[PDB]
Design an enzyme around this catalytic site. Structure first.
Site, mmCIF file in Angstrom:
data_model
loop_
_atom_site.group_PDB
_atom_site.id
_atom_site.type_symbol
_atom_site.label_atom_id
_atom_site.label_comp_id
_atom_site.label_asym_id
_atom_site.label_seq_id
_atom_site.Cartn_x
_atom_site.Cartn_y
_atom_site.Cartn_z
ATOM 1 N N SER A 233 -6.242 -4.549 -6.592
ATOM 2 C CA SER A 233 -7.525 -4.108 -6.047
ATOM 3 C C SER A 233 -8.721 -4.325 -6.981
ATOM 4 O O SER A 233 -9.853 -4.003 -6.616
ATOM 5 C CB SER A 233 -7.455 -2.632 -5.669
ATOM 6 O OG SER A 233 -7.537 -1.816 -6.823
HETATM 7 C C1 LIG Z 1 1.462 -8.810 -0.427
HETATM 8 C C2 LIG Z 1 2.618 -7.880 -0.721
HETATM 9 N N1 LIG Z 1 2.182 -6.804 -1.626
HETATM 10 C C3 LIG Z 1 2.492 -6.897 -3.064
HETATM 11 C C4 LIG Z 1 2.694 -5.505 -3.724
HETATM 12 N N2 LIG Z 1 1.650 -4.542 -3.327
HETATM 13 C C5 LIG Z 1 1.248 -3.488 -4.266
HETATM 14 O O1 LIG Z 1 1.778 -3.423 -5.363
HETATM 15 N N3 LIG Z 1 0.235 -2.524 -3.903
HETATM 16 C C6 LIG Z 1 -0.179 -1.468 -4.855
HETATM 17 C C7 LIG Z 1 -1.570 -0.959 -4.523
HETATM 18 O O2 LIG Z 1 -2.050 -1.204 -3.435
HETATM 19 N N4 LIG Z 1 -2.317 -0.186 -5.515
HETATM 20 C C8 LIG Z 1 -3.674 0.280 -5.230
HETATM 21 C C9 LIG Z 1 -4.602 -0.666 -5.919
HETATM 22 O O3 LIG Z 1 -4.304 -1.897 -6.022
HETATM 23 O O4 LIG Z 1 -5.669 -0.241 -6.406
HETATM 24 C C10 LIG Z 1 -4.001 1.705 -5.643
HETATM 25 N N5 LIG Z 1 -4.308 1.866 -7.089
HETATM 26 C C11 LIG Z 1 -4.672 3.208 -7.610
HETATM 27 C C12 LIG Z 1 -5.209 3.338 -9.016
HETATM 28 O O5 LIG Z 1 -5.381 4.476 -9.532
HETATM 29 O O6 LIG Z 1 -5.482 2.303 -9.670
HETATM 30 C C13 LIG Z 1 -4.454 4.324 -6.824
HETATM 31 C C14 LIG Z 1 -5.607 5.207 -6.475
HETATM 32 C C15 LIG Z 1 -3.242 4.398 -5.997
HETATM 33 S S1 LIG Z 1 -2.747 2.902 -5.257
HETATM 34 C C16 LIG Z 1 0.845 -0.338 -5.020
HETATM 35 C C17 LIG Z 1 1.741 0.106 -3.886
HETATM 36 C C18 LIG Z 1 2.644 1.136 -4.093
HETATM 37 C C19 LIG Z 1 2.734 1.802 -5.427
HETATM 38 O O7 LIG Z 1 3.640 2.838 -5.644
HETATM 39 C C20 LIG Z 1 1.910 1.388 -6.454
HETATM 40 C C21 LIG Z 1 0.929 0.271 -6.235
HETATM 41 C C22 LIG Z 1 1.056 -4.646 -2.044
HETATM 42 O O8 LIG Z 1 0.191 -3.854 -1.700
HETATM 43 C C23 LIG Z 1 1.475 -5.698 -1.128
HETATM 44 O O9 LIG Z 1 1.210 -5.609 0.070
#
Ligand SMILES: CCN1CCN(C(=O)N[C@@H](C(=O)N[C@H](C(=O)O)[C@@H]2N=C(C(=O)O)[C@@H](C)CS2)c2ccc(O)cc2)C(=O)C1=O
EC number: 3.4.16.4
Length: 509
Positions: free
Chosen positions: A242
């Site tokens: 992200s």
């Molecule tokens: C294409 C296929 N594929 C690849 C993997 N994959 C992913 O690893 N996703 C991640 C994910 O979205 N993280 C988020 C991010 O990026 O920012 C958020 N970051 C946070 C942070 O404080 O910084 C939080 C507030 C909580 S979350 C995530 C999900 C579950 C978790 O147990 C931990 C992280 C995807 O989504 C996905 O679809």
């Protein structure tokens, strides 16, 4: 009569302020004429002892090479212990002045600086990159023998070697030290296996600090792990998660379809796209505004926007800010990464791109992208040498679209439910956290035990001076979210960074 080449003085490498990072110290090399040594065999055990060699194996060697004209006895002694052997007056043995590299800052800048091999030739890092610059041209002196094959020293024919040139790096050593401490602390605190931290001047494109863990002592490299030598900030790539959403958001604002106050329905925090599914972690609301999509890091929210504006608009912005693009630095083993293209973008690939998957970037690239965003959308070329003039950059994001996104990123740090651990006492700081699952060891999918904790940002928000990226691999004992693990490091290092450059506090008290 023959020549012996005399080595050139390798050029000094310093930080941006003149602090020495790699200096060439004098060392002595001793060679001999066996034709003369064989006439003073009584002196051999004393000589061998002075060289720290076995008296018998030393004798064995001088015997086998008795007919020969020239042999080395030992290379790279200190000037003190070297002239100790000269003071033995043993006939047939002579000295050569050579140079050996020393690295005052050791493991703190090892990855950037790199090192020279036994022959004082650049082999890794800046030493390899700027080897032509640093080396210089070696000289030579002629050896003169007489009627009976004895060499005489009273007369000397010599061509002076040309010394190498000084190189001032962009890195600020005071800031490198700070960055190195905090990354090491965070890595040990969280039981992480690797990490990288990049600090960049957004105005000049200069890399003020670049550190990685694990590291190594370039002054003592006996038995060394290949992993410990990697400058991961340039040599290793990752999906940035992200942390690239503000660039997706830049494309949204520039398209003319979206404004900050627009709302997006993200209920129920999931979005099924065929045989695969998109998930929001914090499924705490049905509807979020654009700023809220970044704060709560809604993958569903940014995906819906991406479908509206198309992947072509997103890909362009990411390409313009340098993601998956050549940096122009020419660092040894540096990775371009990958920003893919498809002609026609399907929805799945469009979505995953929007929240930073399917593309691979380096920490230095991510920091470079955030620098443009920080510098009112004005991308400036990267440099790892001291920059004497603020260069011609390229306006990659609109000045207004930049200010909006700058404002939005300031909210994710300062607003409620935001990344509050990234805050800098006395300063308004902007940035974005990220957490990403590592890619499976040679398979289609992703890990579910292994995470990468990310935080990218810049400060001060009122007039951005420096941008920073923090990456931590596989945190394993105190949470794993980027805003939990990487954010505190950003806060710590950025606080020091700013005061070290005498940046005026804009967030009192
Ligand atoms: C294409 C296929 N594929 C690849 C993997 N994959 C992913 O690893 N996703 C991640 C994910 O979205 N993280 C988020 C991010 O990026 O920012 C958020 N970051 C946070 C942070 O404080 O910084 C939080 C507030 C909580 S979350 C995530 C999900 C579950 C978790 O147990 C931990 C992280 C995807 O989504 C996905 O679809």
């Amino acid at each position: 009569v023959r020549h012996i080449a005399i080595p050139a003085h390798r050029g000094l490498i310093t930080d941006r302020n003149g602090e020495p990072l790699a200096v060439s110290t004098p060392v002595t090399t001793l060679w001999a004429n066996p034709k003369e040594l064989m006439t003073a065999k009584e002196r051999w055990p004393q000589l061998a002892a002075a060289l720290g060699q076995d008296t018998k194996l030393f004798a064995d060697r001088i015997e086998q090479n008795a007919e020969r004209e020239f042999i080395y006895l030992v290379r790279g002694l200190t000037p003190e212990q070297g002239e100790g052997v000269i003071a033995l007056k043993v006939p047939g043995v002579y000295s050569i002045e050579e140079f050996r590299r020393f690295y005052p800052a050791g493991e703190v800048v090892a990855h950037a600086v790199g090192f020279t091999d036994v022959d004082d030739r650049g082999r890794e890092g800046i030493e390899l990159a700027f080897d032509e610059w640093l080396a210089g041209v070696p000289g030579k002196r002629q050896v003169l023998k007489d009627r009976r094959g004895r060499v005489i020293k009273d007369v000397q024919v010599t061509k002076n070697a040309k010394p190498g040139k000084t190189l001032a790096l962009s890195i600020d050593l005071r800031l490198q030290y700070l960055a190195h401490r905090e990354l090491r602390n965070a890595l040990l605190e969280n039981g992480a296996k690797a990490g990288s931290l990049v600090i960049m001047d957004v105005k000049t494109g200069e890399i003020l600090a670049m550190t990685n863990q694990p590291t190594y002592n370039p002054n003592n490299r006996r038995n060394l792990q290949p992993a410990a030598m990697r400058n991961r900030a340039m040599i290793d790539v990752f999906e940035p998660g992200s942390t690239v959403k503000p660039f997706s958001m830049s494309a949204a604002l520039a398209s003319g379809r979206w404004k900050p106050s627009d709302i997006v329905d993200v209920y129920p925090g999931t979005l099924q796209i065929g045989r695969y599914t998109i998930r929001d972690v914090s499924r705490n609301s049905r509807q979020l505004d654009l700023t809220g999509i970044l704060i709560k890091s809604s993958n569903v929210g940014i995906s819906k926007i991406a479908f509206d504006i198309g992947a072509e608009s997103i890909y362009s912005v990411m390409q313009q800010v340098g993601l998956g693009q050549d940096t122009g630095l020419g660092f040894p083993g540096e990775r371009v990464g990958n920003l893919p293209n498809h002609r026609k973008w399907p929805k799945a690939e469009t979505a995953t791109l929007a929240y930073g998957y399917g593309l691979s970037v380096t920490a230095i690239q991510l920091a470079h992208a955030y620098a443009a965003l920080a510098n009112d959308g004005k991308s400036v070329p990267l440099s790892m040498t001291r920059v004497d003039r603020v260069p011609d950059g390229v306006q990659v994001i609109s000045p207004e679209v930049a200010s909006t996104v700058q404002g939005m990123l300031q909210q994710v740090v300062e607003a409620q439910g935001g990344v509050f651990r990234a805050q800098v006492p006395g300063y308004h700081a902007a940035g974005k956290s990220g957490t990403a699952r590592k890619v499976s060891v040679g398979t289609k999918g992703y890990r579910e035990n292994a995470y990468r904790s990310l935080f990218a940002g810049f400060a001060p928000a009122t007039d951005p001076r420096i941008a920073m990226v923090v990456v931590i691999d596989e945190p394993s004992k105190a949470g794993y979210f980027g805003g939990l693990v990487s954010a505190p490091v950003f806060s710590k290092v950025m606080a020091g960074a700013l005061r070290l450059m005498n940046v005026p506090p804009d967030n009192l008290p």
